[PDB]
């Protein structure tokens, strides 16, 4: 298909404050959401049916991520901790303590024996899921860390920061394998490996998304037209149908670009506030989006 045609299917209400992140379970059956309301909510990915609320954090949550088998979840909160949850029971299995300020981002590695987190305390931490103890503390950046992501097999970790840098780390040793630098150094608000692990998608707060070939350290594509100079908005690689780049925007729309041509192929209208997060279903052409306080809802969209 030359251009997708996503249409609204469901509007999920429940959160009492701005929504912060939405993620589809790897098995595609669930959608998890975190919010400034200190809660995690689980929803049916196909019927949008509310499943349950997961509570425990003392302050707002900025991110949540799924384990490889869709059974566990990890959340990053302003209470300076991360918590690992058993999705089926809703119980907190462990509380990861170590950061000295807000925990902003988190992810499990493919094996899911590890969790990586980024905090306002300017560090990146690697944790042992089983024990809940901090294995490594990396002096990753000189400003708050906005994103952390493991590559395809978990051998690498990429981080982003308001310090204007994007760095690649060797998971095993914790050593910095590379630093992507810009001469204008605009804050990097988000970063993530491509499904192939060969490229990195990075957002800077100058309304720009870039596709990098980290190894060679060269920018291959740039996506513009959307609005992003204030918040750390998630971006995605959509691969179930055509190959697109999906991102939220500060103009209340969801942008979709053709990855190769960089042309905007569709803009999803409907939210009534900044679309801070978007996620792409693992097998179906389904997009999930979430907005800030004047909206507070999550929307599910589908095309084909």
């Amino acid at each position: 298909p030359v251009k997708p045609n996503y249409a609204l299917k469901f509007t999920l209400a429940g959160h009492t404050k701005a929504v912060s992140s939405v993620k589809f379970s790897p098995n595609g059956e669930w959608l998890a959401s975190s919010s400034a309301d200190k809660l995690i909510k689980i929803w049916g990915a196909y019927d949008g049916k509310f499943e349950k609320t997961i509570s425990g954090h003392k302050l707002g949550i900025s991110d949540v991520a799924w384990s490889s088998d869709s059974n566990l979840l990890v959340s990053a909160s302003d209470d300076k901790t991360l918590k690992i949850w058993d999705v089926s029971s809703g119980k907190c299995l462990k509380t990861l303590k170590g950061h000295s300020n807000y925990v902003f981002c988190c992810n499990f590695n493919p094996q899911s024996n590890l969790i990586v987190s980024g905090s306002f305390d300017e560090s990146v931490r690697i944790w042992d899921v089983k024990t809940g103890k901090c294995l490594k503390t990396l002096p990753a950046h000189s400003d708050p860390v906005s994103a952390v992501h493991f590559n395809r097999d978990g051998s690498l970790i990429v981080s982003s920061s308001y310090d204007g840098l994007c760095r690649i780390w060797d998971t095993a040793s914790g050593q910095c394998l590379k630093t992507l630098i810009d001469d204008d150094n605009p804050p990097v608000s988000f970063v993530k490996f491509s499904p192939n692990g060969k490229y990195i998608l990075a957002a800077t707060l100058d309304n720009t998304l870039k596709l990098w070939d980290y190894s060679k350290g060269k920018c291959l594509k740039t996506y513009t037209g959307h609005k992003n100079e204030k918040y750390c908005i998630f971006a995605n690689f959509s691969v179930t149908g055509g190959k697109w780049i999906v991102s939220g925007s500060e103009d209340n729309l969801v942008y979709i670009w053709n990855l190769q041509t960089k042309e905007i192929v569709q803009k999803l209208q409907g939210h009534t506030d900044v679309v801070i997060s978007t996620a792409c279903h693992p097998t179906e052409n389904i997009i999930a989006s979430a907005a800030l306080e004047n909206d507070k809802t999550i929307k599910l969209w589908k095309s084909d």
């Binding site: 404050k17 701005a18 929504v19 912060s20 992140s21 919010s35 400034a36 707002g60 900025s62 991110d63 302003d78 807000y102 902003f104 204030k230 918040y231 750390c232 801070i276 800030l292 306080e293």
Partner: peptide, 5 residues
């Protein structure tokens, strides 16, 4: 506080 300022 990602939802924030």
């Amino acid at each position: 506080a990602r939802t924030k300022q």
